[PDB]
Each structure stands twice: as structure tokens, then as C-alpha cells.
Amino acid sequence: FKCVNSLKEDHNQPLFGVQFNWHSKEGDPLVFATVGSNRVTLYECHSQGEIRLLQSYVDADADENFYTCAWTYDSNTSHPLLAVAGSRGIIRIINPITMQCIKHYVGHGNAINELKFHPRDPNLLLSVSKDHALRLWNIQTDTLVAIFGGVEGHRDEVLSADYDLLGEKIMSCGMDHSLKLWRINSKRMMNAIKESYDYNPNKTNRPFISQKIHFPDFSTRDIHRNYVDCVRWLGDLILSKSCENAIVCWKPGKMEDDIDKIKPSESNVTILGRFDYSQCDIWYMRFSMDFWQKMLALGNQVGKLYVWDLEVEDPHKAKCTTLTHHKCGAAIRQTSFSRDSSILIAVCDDASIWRWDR
Numbered sequence: 422f423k424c425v426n427s428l429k430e431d432h433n434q435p436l437f438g439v440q441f442n443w444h445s446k447e448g449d450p451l452v453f454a455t456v457g458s459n460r461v462t463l464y465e466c467h468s469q470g471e472i473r474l475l476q477s478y479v480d481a482d483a484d485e486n487f488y489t490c491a492w493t494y495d496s497n498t499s500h501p502l503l504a505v506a507g508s509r510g511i512i513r514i515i516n517p518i519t520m521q522c523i524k525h526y527v528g529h530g531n532a533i534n535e536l537k538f539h540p541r542d543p544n545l546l547l548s549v550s551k552d553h554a555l556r557l558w559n560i561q562t563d564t565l566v567a568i569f570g571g572v573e574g575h576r577d578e579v580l581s582a583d584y585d586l587l588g589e590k591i592m593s594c595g596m597d598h599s600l601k602l603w604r605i606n607s608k609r610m611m612n613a614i615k616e617s618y619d620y621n622p623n624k625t626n627r628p629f630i631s632q633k634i635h636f637p638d639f640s641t642r643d644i645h646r647n648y649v650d651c652v653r654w655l656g657d658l659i660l661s662k663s664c665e666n667a668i669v670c671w672k673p674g675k676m677e678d679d680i681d682k683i684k685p686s687e688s689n690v691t692i693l694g695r696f697d698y699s700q701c702d703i704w705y706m707r708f709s710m711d712f713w714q715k716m717l718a719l720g721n722q723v724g725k726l727y728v729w730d731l732e733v734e735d736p737h738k739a740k741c742t743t744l745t746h747h748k749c750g751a752a753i754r755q756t757s758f759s760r761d762s763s764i765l766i767a768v769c770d771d772a773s774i775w776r777w778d779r
């Protein structure tokens with residue numbers, strides 16, 4: 422990777438999120454979204470490092486602060502869609518072509534820290550909230566499928582979550598120091614998703630009933646000793662970090678325990694490795710993976726990028742490379758790889774954007 426360009430957004434506030442559109446069409450240039458202040462902005466990557474500015478959506482409320490975005494597509498037309506959310510607790514579904522807000526969702530209206538789309542179903546959107554819950558939405562029928570909470574759920578803000586490969590289960594994490602597993606391939610949840618697709622408020626009198634899921638299928642506070650701010654599945658293993666200068670690779674149970682035989686009472690975890698780094702001990706810093714999960718990237722609080730090659734026989738054998746530029750000194754909140762892994766974008770606390778090309 423070589424640094425080929427940079428720019429800075431005019432708001433001078435932190436850029437909290439960046440996502441390439443991995444649903445961009447064949448023959449179209451690569452496009453990424455950034456979120457910060459009260460806006461979302463799209464850019465196109467071109468030759469000679471060119472980052473071409475397209476168009477933003479700016480919230481009507483000057484005090485909105487977007488924290489997260491996620492791409493999907495319209496399941497009938499194939500056109501890409503962009504979901505954004507943040508401090509107002511409003512999910513907006515944006516048409517990236519025109520930057521129109523197509524529709525919006527409100528749960529209880531508390532800050533949303535992360536959005537993720539289901540890996541197999543483009544209509545299923547997961548939101549994680551400051552109000553300690555996760556919510557699963559069906560953006561085809563505009564239904565709240567399920568709320569994951571209760572006293573056995575998270576006890577402080579939820580900061581991140583991730584679906585597994587097939588979208589059969591979710592791992593969430595947050596300020597309570599815990600990582601929690603929620604299975605969504607239960608008979609109850611499969612039925613709830615089916616029912617959400619059968620719901621049309623114009624053809625019935627009932628409201629749509631959301632599931633209240635109050636018990637995770639596994640919980641641990643034994644991995645980290647502070648806020649857990651990013652989580653990703655790597656097959657049946659988990660990668661998670663806190664503010665302790667480490668990403669930990671771990672699994673529920675003992676070494677030979679199958680993830681789908683783990684019981685909610687399971688008290689053990691197994692640590693398969695740990696990727697240490699420096700100067701990333703402030704709260705709220707995300708890591709990202711490429712589409713194939715061959716690579717992992719994290720920025721630190723002084724503008725350095727760490728990239729790990731995970732194409733090795735065991736997690737602890739990952740190969741690290743570091744990327745620095747003398748003008749990039751602000752905290753990197755999130756990174757994104759293009760689908761082919763040819764471009765890595767980093768976004769920063771000073772509203773700067775950095776492009777690295779292979």
C-alpha cells in the first residue's frame with residue numbers, strides 16, 4: 422500500500438465512519454461513503470489517486486451527529502441504498518444517486534452507534550443503541566422484527582455488533598465490557614422474520630408484533646477490561662477490541678467446543694491469539710476487514726495504520742504491516758477496504774480522508 426491522496430471535509434468535525442459500497446456495479450468506479458457532523462458524503466475513486474466528490478445528504482437538524490453507515494441494495498430493483506444513523510436515534514435510508522432520504526425509522530429515539538446489514542438478506546438491518554438494546558428491522562415491510570435487551574442483555578451502551586457468515590447469529594458488545602451472542606436461527610426468530618415479510622399494514626388491522634429477546638445465548642466479560650468498541654466474526658471465532666491496544670481472537674467455550682453446541686450457561690472462553698499495537702487506548706476506534714476476510718485494518722490515535730494478513734494457518738500467526746504518512750497525525754476512527762482490497766480509506770478526527778492503493 423502507498424498513500425496516493427488525502428482531503429479534508431469542510432465541517433472540521435470527526436469522521437466517525439467510512440464504507441465502500443461492495444454492491445457497486447461492474448464497470449462503475451469504486452464509491453465510498455463518509456459520515457460525520459450532520460452529513461453523509463459520497464466519493465468516487467479514480468486513477469492517479471483522484472478522490473472525486475459527488476454529493477452529500479445534510480440533516481435538517483444542525484445538532485444531528487451521524488455515527489454510522491451501511492450499504493445495501495433494493496431487493497426488487499438492485500439499486501444500492503445507504504443507511505445512516507447517529508445521535509438523534511433516527512435511521513435514514515438514503516438513495517445514494519440523488520441523496521434523497523427515502524424513508525426513516527425510529528425505535529425509542531436514543532443514539533444509534535452502529536448499523537449492519539444481514540449478509541444474506543439485504544432487507545434485514547441491525548441497529549445497536551445507547552439505550553442498551555439491539556434492534557432488527559425489515560426495511561422491505563418497514564417492520565421492527567425484534568428487540569434484543571432485558572436485564573440479561575447489555576447494561577450500558579451497545580457499541581458494535583456483527584452477524585456471522587450466514588446471518589444465523591449476532592455477537593454484540595459495549596460499555597458494560599461484555600460480548601453477547603444472540604441466535605437468530607431459532608424457530609422463534611425464523612418465524613418472526615417470515616411474519617415480518619407477510620406484514621402489510623394496508624391489508625390488516627393488527628400492528629406488527631416485535632419479538633422481545635431478553636436472554637443472550639452466551640455472554641462474557643472475560644476478554645477485555647474496558648469498553649468493547651468493535652467486534653467481528655472470523656468464521657466461528659471472534660475478533661474484538663477495547664482500548665487496551667489489542668484485538669483479541671477468541672471463542673466461546675473450550676478449544677474443541679462447537680459454537681452451535683454452546684449453552685447460555687457457558688462460563689469458559691478460549692483465547693486463540695492477540696494482535697497488539699500502540700497508541701490506540703482512547704475509546705471508540707473501529708477495525709475493519711476486507712470482503713474475503715483475508716485482511717484486517719485498524720488506525721490509531723496518532724494517524725498510523727496497522728494491517729494484518731490473516732491468510733495463515735492459525736490466528737496468532739497473522740502478519741502485520743504498518744502504514745504511516747508524515748502529514749497524517751489525527752486519530753483514525755474507521756477504515757474501509759474496497760471489495761477487491763486494492764484501496765484502503767482511512768478517516769480521521771480532523772475530518773481528513775486518506776487513500777492508500779496497492
Ligand SMILES: CN(C)[C@H]1CN(Cc2c(F)cccc2Br)C[C@@H]1c1cn(C)c2ccccc12
Nearest residue numbers: 435437488534535578580581650705706707754
Ligand atoms: C458517545 N458514544 C458512546 C460515541 C460512540 N461513537 C460511535 C463509535 C462506537 F460506538 C464504537 C467505535 C467507534 C465509534 Br466512532 C459515537 C459517539 C461519540 C460522540 N462524540 C462526540 C464522539 C467523539 C469521539 C468519539 C466518539 C464520539
